[PDB]
Amino acid sequence: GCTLSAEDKAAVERSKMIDRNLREDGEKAAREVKLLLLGAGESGKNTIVKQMKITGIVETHFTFKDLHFKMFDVGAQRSERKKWIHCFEGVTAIIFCVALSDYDLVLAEDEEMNRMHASMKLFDSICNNKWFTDTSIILFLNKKDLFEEKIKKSPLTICYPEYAGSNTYEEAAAYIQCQFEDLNKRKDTKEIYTHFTCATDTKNVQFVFDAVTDVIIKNNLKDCGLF
Amino acid sequence: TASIAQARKLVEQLKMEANIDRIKVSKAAADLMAYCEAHAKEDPLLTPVPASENPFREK
Amino acid sequence: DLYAHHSTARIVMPLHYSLVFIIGLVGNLLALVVIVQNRKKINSTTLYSTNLVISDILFTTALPTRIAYYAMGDALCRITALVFYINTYAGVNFMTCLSIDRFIAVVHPLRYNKIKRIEHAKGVCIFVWILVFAQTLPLLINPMSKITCMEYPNFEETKSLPWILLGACFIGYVLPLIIILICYSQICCKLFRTAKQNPLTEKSGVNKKALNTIILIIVVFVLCFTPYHVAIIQHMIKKLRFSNFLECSQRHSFQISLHFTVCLMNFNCCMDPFIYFFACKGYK
Amino acid sequence: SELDQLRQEAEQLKNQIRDARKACADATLSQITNNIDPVGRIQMRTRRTLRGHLAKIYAMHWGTDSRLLVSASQDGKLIIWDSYTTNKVHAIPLRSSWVMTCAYAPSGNYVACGGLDNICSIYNLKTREGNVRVSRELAGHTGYLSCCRFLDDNQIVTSSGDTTCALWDIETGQQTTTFTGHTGDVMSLSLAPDTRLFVSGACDASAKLWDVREGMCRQTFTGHESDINAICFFPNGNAFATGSDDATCRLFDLRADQELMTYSHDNIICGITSVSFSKSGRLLLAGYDDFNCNVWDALKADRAGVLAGHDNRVSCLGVTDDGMAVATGSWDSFLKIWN
Amino acid sequence: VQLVESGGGLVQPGGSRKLSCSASGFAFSSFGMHWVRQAPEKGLEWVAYISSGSGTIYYADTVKGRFTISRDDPKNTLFLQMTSLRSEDTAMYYCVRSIYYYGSSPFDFWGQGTTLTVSSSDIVMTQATSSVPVTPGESVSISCRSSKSLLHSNGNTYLYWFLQRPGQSPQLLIYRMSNLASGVPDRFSGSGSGTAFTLTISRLEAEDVGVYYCMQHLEYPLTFGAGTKLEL
Ligand SMILES: C[C@H](CCCC(C)(C)O)[C@H]1CC[C@H]2[C@@H]3[C@H](O)C=C4C[C@@H](O)CC[C@]4(C)[C@H]3CC[C@]12C
């Protein structure tokens, strides 16, 4: 009838069972959230991982409100970024940790460059990347508690010589957030959520959950065609 | 210091790479062309085989 | 004289129907090419949208033969009566099942990714196609003899129509209407619930566009399909309460009403690609 | 100073090497292959389409029997196919879904993989339990492991993104030789047919011919203008073609020590991801970023054909040891076997 | 790898029983399993088959309707439930592991078998002789003739050579007429074509004495042979 021998039919049975297992595993994987965790060196990524109840890629799993998140920290991967970022093309969100006080600090051997300029250079390189044309970004301006002391001591004229505001935390934070979000060149295809954190801020996971729920519903409305 | 050893390694590597007997491009190209010619009869992608010998067309 | 208004009809009807045909052609071939060019989208909603635009394209090809009897002639009419009357209703079920898809994609997305695959989508497409096939088949095996080819009075006889046309209108319009309203009401309710819950959804306002598009689809479907079917059901219930018949004024006004509302029931095909272009954001 | 002295010595040596290379180019390959008849047109049709992956397929490798395939995808899955009947013989779940390479052993017993975790996993296929266990996990690289090739059932040659390649003994798990000398990220390997030499191309516009026995960089070839993403040896082991990120393949020669041929087309500006010769070496198949694979007449630099059946960027290619078929993996989660 | 059967003993004719094959030491959920019985003297006869999951279930026509196979994957257990036994079912029953893919080695492991005593078209395969005398050190040749051409169209011939040592379960020796099984010394070789097959053994040992069976895997029911015996 089908000209297949007995072993051929049994091999096709094995193939179909493998297909079933692949489909079930893919369905299990598609219901998880994948967050790529980026940022400059010593921006407070490890602080964020400690806050959220948790060599090569450091992959951290955690559940919250019946939603499983997998956070991929790639700061340990010291190679050409443009050679492996394209494998993170299908993540749902890019968490981006930026230190706030770091506007008045320099890390690397290059002592002339203020490291906030390097941080927002990295932000501009990631946000406007051709692989992340529609992958939403979740900013995390860390250590806002230590930012106030540096505001009292040293204004934004060091990092931003074009500073117009006063030496108050609210105006400075708003200006920094505006400067960051204006680096987006894809404002229609991609949203940028911003949140000010600290060491004791336990509302971080709540903000991540809200932003991820927004991105998932927007993706579903895009697949429906409604959006 | 540190860079002196790296420069020494690079110079020794280039010393090892400078002393190689290179044949003319004529002879190497002729060998490549002769290999491509002598095995043309045994290339299924180059010379298409009948559908009876193709194990992918038997359905 | 049930065709006394042939003086004004030969003015209004052909210009309008030709406008319908040209707008449908230009807005549907463009939609088809921007769908097949975007070959990355291979989900079930893509399949239903393709089936819908193919059905409406076939209707636009079906229109220039039916436009013949609008000015003052073989049995070919009957065959045309097939390719006309399937396509619009071939639209309807699609406009239903697609909506179901959208509902099951937004509220219960896990079951959407589980059971609502490409395989089940193709299966239910073939199911819908054969379901409309079997229902429109008896129209092919009926002659439409004379002076006017597509004459519903020559078609109609009180033997079996008054109870099969009500059921046909029911299964064609009333159940799809209820399904569309249920699905889109659930979608809107879930979007409102999310807007109440998440602050970032209320801030960014991603759901307002979806709300506008949903209310637009609902109002265009209702305004397009309601008058024809409510005229049919109203005439059936009037036949019930008025058992006899007068072809001077009552049936004449019924003919004018039906010939009027079929304009909108086919005009749906003009607004449908505009719905597709308004719904999707970046392809317009 | 001593630093400037050594640098001037190195520059004099580079000038001597360039002068010796120019002293051998008495003719060009396009001048010797002028009277040979052209290949003609090559229309190859998709014979098989292997579905089952749910994400980008990043690498593949034919078995030595020209029938079985291994294909690794960032679904997290390494599937072993029977290419004659499209049956999935095996499906192996990886511990880290960020795989970028795979290799099928030349005996058929083992299968390697690795990726953005700096660890090469050796899976055993033929066990008494019918299962597929992790026979070994070779660790020691400090960058992403870009390519991987079985030298034998006991020795393997890896190349990672920390500017180095290594030769592992699988039975113990230690680097018996570390090939260093590159300055950019190493992206591809290609063992010689006589399995005593191998070439590696970096993100430095440089390929290097290493001797696998001693561990010394025998020769260094430059000429590209961007990163090198794929290398394959010519079937006799005396030439190799490198595909680069500047939309250019280049055929280099080992004995002549020079670049022989440049395969480029003005309508092509997309980077190359995969290179593989045919069985006779007359065809050079190159997978591009513009969603198709071009088939070049390797002796005339003409473009003999196009394979344009994919929807996304074309990842690793493969030509069977029989030369019967050409398998093409891509980012749209489908393999396509052409003939 | 271990398969242990249990549930034998003495049964009255017309009764019922349930044989249980407990598996230990392999991925039981992925192996097709067979029940193969052997009469007190008559040689092996295939009984029943259960697939990798719980797919196709085949039965020998002589036991269709009376027997049924259950399979518990989470407990690694096979079940042959027998109803209305006859005096033809008194036999030793072997649980047989077999996995099917490209290049696989089916029928490779046989359980120890349990004894069930009961109180009081088809590819027939013929082995030429019932017994041939041997001396340790000389090459021998065993023949097996099929009734139908075992050479399938896809290139494979589907004949299997098994050896049963005295008082043990028969192990696999050759699968698909050429391929040795893993763990078999390279003294045995298989050859032949169509409906004529030969197993040629090199220098014999005291462990090569036994009974050699041939089987065909084209279509169910899988029909064993008579069983050529060797004597020292
Ligand atoms: C052709 C006639 C008279 C109309 C005369 C004019 C000139 C207006 O066309 C119209 C009148 C009512 C129509 C049906 C009605 O819509 C219910 C559906 C169910 C659906 O599944 C399949 C199509 C079907 C049966 C319609 C077929 C055709 C019908 C009979």
Task: Report DSSP letters for D185-197, one per residue.
Answer: -EEEEEE-TTSSE
CA pair distance C272, A161, nearest whole angstrom:
55
Q: Which residues contact E123 (CB under 8 A, 6 or more apart)?
A: E146, E147, E148, E150, E216, E218, E219, E223
Chains E and A touch (3+ CB pairs under 8 A): yes
Per the CB < 8 A criterion, the answer to whether D127 and D175 are in contact is no
Q: Do A8 and E53 touch (CB under 8 A)?
A: no
CA pair distance D337, D46, nearest whole angstrom:
6
How many other C-beta atoms are found inside a 10 Å radius of the C-beta of residue A207? Answer: 19
Q: Residue A133: which region, alpha, beta or left (left: phi > 0; alpha: psi -120 to 50)? A: alpha
Q: Which fold has domain E125-230?
A: Immunoglobulin-like (2.60.40)
Per the CB < 8 A criterion, the answer to whether D61 and D113 are in contact is no
CA pair distance E115, E7, nearest whole angstrom:
8
Considering only CB atoms, which chain D residues are within 8 Å of E153?
Answer: none
Handedness of CA A115, A116, A117, A122 (dihedral sign): positive
Rounded to the nearest 5 degrees, what angle is found at the Cα of A193, between the Cα atoms of A190 and A196? 160
Q: What is the per-residue burial (b if ≥16 Cβ within 10 Å, else e) of A211-222?
A: bbbbbebbebbb
Q: Which residues contact C223 (CB under 8 A, 6 or more apart)?
A: C264
Mutate-to-test residue for ligand 1 from C89, C92, C149, highest number of ligand atoms within 8 A of CB: C89
Chains A and C touch (3+ CB pairs under 8 A): yes
What secondary structure letter does DSSP report for A82?
G
Domain positions in chain A: 82-218
CA pair distance D63, D102, nearest whole angstrom:
11
E101 backbone dihedrals φ, ψ, rounded to 5°: -150, -170
C130 backbone dihedrals φ, ψ, rounded to 5°: -70, -30
Residue span of the structural domain in which D256 resides: 2-338
Residue span of the structural domain in which C263 resides: 1-284
Q: Do E182 and D90 touch (CB under 8 A)?
A: no
Per the CB < 8 A criterion, the answer to whether D146 and D185 are in contact is yes
Can you give the CATH number for the domain in which D242 is found?
2.130.10.10
Residue having the nearest C-alpha atom to atom 4 of ligand 1: C152
Q: Do D77 and A57 touch (CB under 8 A)?
A: no
Per the CB < 8 A criterion, the answer to whether D67 and D324 are in contact is no
- Cα atoms in the 13 Å half-sphere on the side-chain side of C255: 20
Q: Do D339 and B11 touch (CB under 8 A)?
A: no
Q: Do A13 and E220 touch (CB under 8 A)?
A: no
Identity of the residue in D3, D21, D33 whose CB atom sits nearest the CB atom of B33? D33
Q: 3-state DSSP call for residue C93?
A: helix
CA pair distance E51, E58, nearest whole angstrom:
9
What secondary structure letter does DSSP report for A111?
-
CA pair distance D94, D103, nearest whole angstrom:
14
Domain positions in chain E: 2-118, 125-230
CA pair distance E157, E149, nearest whole angstrom:
9
Closest CA to D189 of D203, D175, D200, D205: D200
CA A51 to chain CA mean position, Å: 15
Q: What residues does ligand 1 touch, defined as CB less than 6 Å away?
A: C 85, 89, 132, 135-136, 139, 150, 152, 165, 168-169, 172, 232, 258-259, 262
Question: Token match 């040293």: residue?
Answer: A154
Amino acid letter for position E161: W
Listed by number, the residues of chain A in 28-57 with a beta carbon closer than 8 Å to a beta carbon of chain D are 29, 55-57
CA pair distance E104, D92, nearest whole angstrom:
17
Helix axes C76-106, C250-279, angle to 10 degrees: 50
Per the CB < 8 A criterion, the answer to whether D71 and D81 are in contact is yes
CA pair distance D84, D78, nearest whole angstrom:
18
CA pair distance D142, A56, nearest whole angstrom:
8
Both tokens assigned to D293? 């694979």
Q: Is the peptide bond between E221 and the residue preceding it cis, with omega within 30 degrees of 0? A: yes
Handedness of CA E163, E169, E174, E179 (dihedral sign): negative
Elucidation technique: cryo-EM
Both tokens assigned to C51? 């089936």
Rounded to the nearest 5 degrees, what angle is found at the Cα of A176, between the Cα atoms of A170 and A178? 100
C-alpha distances in Å from residue C133, one per residue of C13, C49, C82, C140, C256: 28, 19, 9, 11, 29
Per the CB < 8 A criterion, the answer to whether C173 and C233 are in contact is no
Whether CATH 1.20.140.10 fits E2-118: no
Q: Do E154 and A9 touch (CB under 8 A)?
A: no
CA pair distance E32, E25, nearest whole angstrom:
15
Q: 3-state DSSP call for residue C174?
A: helix
Q: Does D116 reach chain A within 8 Å, measured CB to CB?
A: yes
What secondary structure letter does DSSP report for A113?
S
Testing the interface with B: which of D5, D8, D13 to mutate, by most B Cβ within 10 A? D13
Per the CB < 8 A criterion, the answer to whether A146 and A101 are in contact is yes
Identity of the residue in E101, E218, E220 whose CB atom sits nearest the CB atom of A14? E101
- Nearest residue of A to residue C113 by CA position? A27
Instruction: Give strand ranges (E) for C88-217.
Output: none
Q: 3-state DSSP call for residue D204?
A: coil
- Nearest residue of E to residue A3 by CA position? E153
Q: Breaks in chain E follow which residues, C to N over 2.5 Å?
A: 120
What secondary structure letter does DSSP report for B24?
P
Q: What is the per-residue burial (b if ≥16 Cβ within 10 Å, else e) of C249-264?
A: eebbebbebbebbbee
Considering only CB atoms, which chain D residues are within 8 Å of C39?
Answer: 311
Dihedral angle over CA of C72, C77, C81, C87, nearest 10: -90
Q: 3-state DSSP call for residue A135?
A: coil
CA pair distance D4, C101, nearest whole angstrom:
72
A59 forms beta bridges with A72
Residue span of the structural domain in which B31 resides: 1-59
Give the right CATH number for A82-218 from 3.40.50.150, 3.40.50.300, 3.30.470.10, 2.102.10.10. Answer: 3.40.50.300
Considering only CB atoms, which chain D residues are within 8 Å of E25?
Answer: 129
If one counts the domains in chain C, the total is 1
Question: Token match 């296929």: residue?
Answer: D125
How many other C-beta atoms are found inside a 10 Å radius of the C-beta of residue D151? Answer: 19
Closest CA to D3 of E29, C169, B2: B2
Rounded to the nearest 5 degrees, what angle is found at the Cα of B5, between the Cα atoms of B4 and B9? 120
CA pair distance D270, D273, nearest whole angstrom:
10
Q: Which residues contact D10 (CB under 8 A, 6 or more apart)?
A: B7, B10, B11, B14
Q: Are strands D239-244 and E179-180 parallel, antiparallel or unpaired?
A: unpaired
C-alpha distances in Å from residue C68, one per residue of A119, C72, C150, E34: 70, 10, 10, 73
Both tokens assigned to D275? 């290179």
Q: 3-state DSSP call for residue C124?
A: helix
User: Mind spelling out the 3-state secondary structure of D245-292?
Assistant: CCCCEEEEECCCCCEEEEECCCCCCCCEEEEEECCCCCEEEEEECCCC
CA pair distance D326, D278, nearest whole angstrom:
9
Q: What is the per-residue burial (b if ≥16 Cβ within 10 Å, else e) of A107-132?
A: beeeeeebbbebbbebbeebbebeeb
Closest CA to C76 of C64, C86, C88: C64
Closest CA to E152 of C44, A5, A143: A5
Closest CA to A212 of A57, A15, A19, A33: A33
Per DSSP, the residues of A14-39 read: HHHHHHHHHHHHHHHHHTSEEEEEEE
Rounded to the nearest 5 degrees, what angle is found at the Cα of D18, between the Cα atoms of D12 and D22? 145
If one counts the domains in chain D, the total is 1
Closest CA to E94 of E1, E18, E170: E170
Q: Are strands A93-99 and A136-142 parallel, antiparallel or unpaired?
A: parallel
Q: Are strands D110-115 and D119-124 parallel, antiparallel or unpaired?
A: antiparallel
Per DSSP, the residues of chain E read: -EEEEE--EEE-TT-EEEEEEEEESS-GGG-EEEEEEEETTTEEEEEEEE-SSS--EEE-TTTTTTEEEEEETTTTEEEEEEES--TT--EEEEEEEE--STT--TT-EE---EEEEE-------EES-SEEE--TTS-EEEEEE-SS--B-TTS-B-EEEEEE-TTSPPEEEEETTTEEPTT--TTEEEEEETTEEEEEE-S--TTS-SEEEEEE-SSSSP-----EEEE-
Q: Which residues contact E78 (CB under 8 A, 6 or more apart)?
A: E20, E21, E23, E33, E35, E50, E69, E70, E71, E95
Looking at ligand 1, which atom is closest to the CA of residue C132? Answer: 21
CA pair distance C229, C166, nearest whole angstrom:
9
C66 assigned to a ligand binding site:
yes
